[PDB]
Write a protein that binds this ligand. Sequence first.
Ligand SMILES: O=c1ccn([C@@H]2O[C@H](COP(=O)(O)OP(=O)(O)O)[C@@H](O)[C@H]2O)c(=O)[nH]1
Lengths: 353, 352
Amino acid sequence: TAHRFLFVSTPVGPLGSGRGGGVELTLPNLAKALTQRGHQVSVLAPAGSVLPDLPLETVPGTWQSTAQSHGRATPAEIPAESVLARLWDRAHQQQADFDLILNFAYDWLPLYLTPFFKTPVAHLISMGSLSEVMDQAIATSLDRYPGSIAVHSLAQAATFPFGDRCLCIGNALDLAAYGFNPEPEPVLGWVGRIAPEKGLEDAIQAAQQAGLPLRVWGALTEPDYWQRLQQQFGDRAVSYQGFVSTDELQRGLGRCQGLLMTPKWVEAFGNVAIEALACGLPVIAYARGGPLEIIEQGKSGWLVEPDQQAALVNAIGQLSSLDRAYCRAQAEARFSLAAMGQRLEAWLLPLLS
Amino acid sequence: TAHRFLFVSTPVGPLGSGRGGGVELTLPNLAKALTQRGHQVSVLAPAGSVLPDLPLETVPGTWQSTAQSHGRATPAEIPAESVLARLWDRAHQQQADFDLILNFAYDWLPLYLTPFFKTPVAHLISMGSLSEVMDQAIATSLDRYPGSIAVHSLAQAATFPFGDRCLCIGNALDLAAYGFNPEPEPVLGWVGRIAPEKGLEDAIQAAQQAGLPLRVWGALTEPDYWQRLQQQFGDRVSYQGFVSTDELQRGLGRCQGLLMTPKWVEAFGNVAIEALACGLPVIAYARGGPLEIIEQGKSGWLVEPDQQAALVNAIGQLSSLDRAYCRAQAEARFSLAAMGQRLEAWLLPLLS
Ligand SMILES: O=c1ccn([C@@H]2O[C@H](COP(=O)(O)OP(=O)(O)O)[C@@H](O)[C@H]2O)c(=O)[nH]1
């Protein structure tokens, strides 16, 4: 049952550098999810990539732009020195060393190339139906290779006309790196860019009105914003906890009574919610996007109406009705590498040969 | 030792539409050159294409663009329903029915796909250097597959930094389709895609100054671009349409000479040799591909670029050139049987 996989990373940026999007966090966990079952995983990724403990080969070139120029009719683009093209030309040279190649990129090229490979190629789609050129490439790959496409959510699968023929593998997190904290301080947390248009003001005003300091984790780009926040809400409002590593983020976040999540719909990913549950921290989130699949209403968090102070404050007031051990228990059951590995095997192993 | 070849056309539009330029004449002629030596040739092209005599397979979808966009920094582009992507998908599915695939398109994708094929893929490049993305794709294919890249002229080769590593196969025509005409009307000809920055203006001015009507053939693009020619110059310049080879050669044969007045590069090969095959000397700016086709003062005039007095002087000396000589040079240099030898010398060694 042990096999050899090659993972081909996203062209959007390096692993380990803060700017491959969500694929940057998922690729290493999925690799671990298989290496922990005895499989070999090697990784191909852009120059500058860092990844502990796995064979890693890096490839030079220009990062794929997130662009989206003319909406749904945007064509696929290949610039000179495309890192995406060179990743796939390199994967093709070495294809006979692997039983299967797993693509993490959301792009036309790898889907198109799939029949030109003798080794089977599977695709983990991380968005979002976004363009005709992409929707048609995935549909065609599905017709020739049933079972070759997976998604992380049903919501994302439903944005595609062929969504029922994609497999859902869910989300995973390296739970070993997250300590359960059953005894928090009377503080709330918020995770994200300390910048305008992130819903930070909504979190601050609801924490303060609820009577609890807000700790924040993330990147400060404009110090004048920090000052504006102080002038709006005073200097006991928000406490800067750092940009800060995974291990640092988890002991910090774990001491919170709850995590507030107030992002715009286009930034409403579920990743940080999982990290919160893993520390035993319940989540109060706007009831749209990624959190709707992570949080169990009245049990592991509260899903509230967007942009309404009273809904945040009513939720914060009811954090004590949620059991922190149940949050952790849900993370162990739903989002572990163990759970993920089994879902990967179910998906991939029928594709071998 | 007969062989099976698959020719893949340009994705810029159907064969017969005029949208693909000289490639629409080159690909059927080269197919004919090989089939005359006993080989089998099949063609794959966009939906709407026509090809007398040969197996053709067509594929629907959206046409590739001219690719002039931006300048050298234009990325390669693959739209939804890309005819280019579907052509190469179809070539791949049938690669085992052929000994070699010959690509005629000036595009990243076929170059990129070459190592993904088991059947060998050669490339006949019809343009000079235009982009970073294409320059690099060609170089990389040359690096891995020496001898797999061909051009039509040494001048076109010299626009690339790796030009000395390309094989030049020149130009040829189906000579039996072109009638020699020894008795021209007092008119001048111009043949090409009708469009800005193609030199049409210079040609019109020079003909009018020399007091000879200009007859113009070619695929158009917006009739506004036409109008203003009759009220900056006047005349009927006389537009003859976009026509078949048989129509073009009978029209062009009536001309005293052909004007080629490109602003840039190019304008490499096909129309100058067609004019010669009819017996019509060529007056061209001395830049680009014309230098290698025309024999100065015998089959044409090669004059200082961008000088109207030069063209008018040349128009003035058309009489002294021998029309039979132009035709004899077409026969000696631009024949299909010779192209047939050159193509085999290029392609046969790329097999197994
Ligand atoms: O009425 C016409 C005018 C032109 N042509 C053909 O158009 C091509 C020349 O195209 P162009 O000058 O656009 O050459 P390009 O620069 O596109 O290769 C030649 O092969 C001609 O045989 C034609 O068939 N009928």
